[PDB]
Amino acid sequence: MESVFEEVFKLLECPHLNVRKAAHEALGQFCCALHKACQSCPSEPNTAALQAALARVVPSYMQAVNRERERQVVMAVLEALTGVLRSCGTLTLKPPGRLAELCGVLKAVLQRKTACEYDAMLLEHAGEAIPALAAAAGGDSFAPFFAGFLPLLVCKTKQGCTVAEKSFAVGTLAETIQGLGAASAQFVSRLLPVLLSTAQEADPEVRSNAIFGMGVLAEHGGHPAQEHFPKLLGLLFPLLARERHDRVRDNICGALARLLMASPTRKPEPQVLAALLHALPLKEDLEEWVTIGRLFSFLYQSSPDQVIDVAPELLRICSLILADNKIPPDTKAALLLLLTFLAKQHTDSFQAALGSLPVDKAQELQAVL
């Protein structure tokens, strides 16, 4: 299959833009699809083909990022590069120094030090590129290089930058925090100030990504991130009260759920939990239904005697969630788990909890009797 590669490769010297773009993305698609062949028949006379493909396609991507003049070509090269990074994985980072060279390339994007507000979208493609590279390297093998990427992202976050820059910085920082995962425990004392600072910007998206960063940081914060838990609450607890925007509110519920799950000893108290459930149902950012859906399972699994106090709240929420088509079914199931723990154990307290619901909608829930 090296023929198709070597013929679509020389196409990169064409004087036209669309031809170079389509050739780059085509090479990427062939790498990604040739990886999908190494799984059905994992016999290895064609894994050598996959490596013999990435060994020329990936460096062509790096050099293309540095040297190619047209910004759109660099954009599509970063999208396709993120694709090959995500599908294949370690086989991209197999030759020595490959991870370091990729990090250098993305830094070259992040310093405007390339051959080229398209800047927001190019920086965005690098933004997608980074956490995929983290997931490929595996967080542990990526941590020092992330210590490289930290100050460059912190640069685009201070007052004076365009809000597209701020949103890109905090979003990339967050998804990369959950990229490192358990290994992000070492970057708490250096990531936390940035999130605590961008949680106050006058823009909805910047705060919606800041609070989210605080949340995933609290999740994969290993352990030294929970020493800042009374601080994080101190910022989120009042904010949820005053936040007049829907999206930021949704991400605040997700973050509060994440740090509620992140502490299996402290912070199970009913003011935080009650404010969380009271801020429900989610209205605008429906990707966090999975998070609170897991919060329900955590409640039933470890601290179930708390679900008695919030029985009218849980009922008032479950009465609404069932109708929505775009609420994930496993989330509804996670709510019905708690409600079942109320219908048998703590029976009459759940009965009285059914006393505040509209009699019409208090019997749709008893359609599961």
UniProtKB/Swiss-Prot annotation:
Superkingdom of the organism of origin: Eukaryota
Chain positions of HEAT repeats: 186-223, 227-265
Location relative to the cell: Cytoplasm; Nucleus
Function description: Nuclear transport receptor that mediates nuclear import of proteins, such as histones, RPS3A, TNP2 and VDR. Serves as receptor for nuclear localization signals (NLS) in cargo substrates. Is thought to mediate docking of the importin/substrate complex to the nuclear pore complex (NPC) through binding to nucleoporin and the complex is subsequently translocated through the pore by an energy requiring, Ran-dependent mechanism.
Family of this protein: Belongs to the importin beta family.
Quaternary data: Found in a cytosolic complex with ASF1 (ASF1A or ASF1B) and histones H3 and H4.
Listed name of the protein: Importin-4
Protein source organism: Homo sapiens (Human)
Parent-protein residues present: 695 to 1078 of 1081
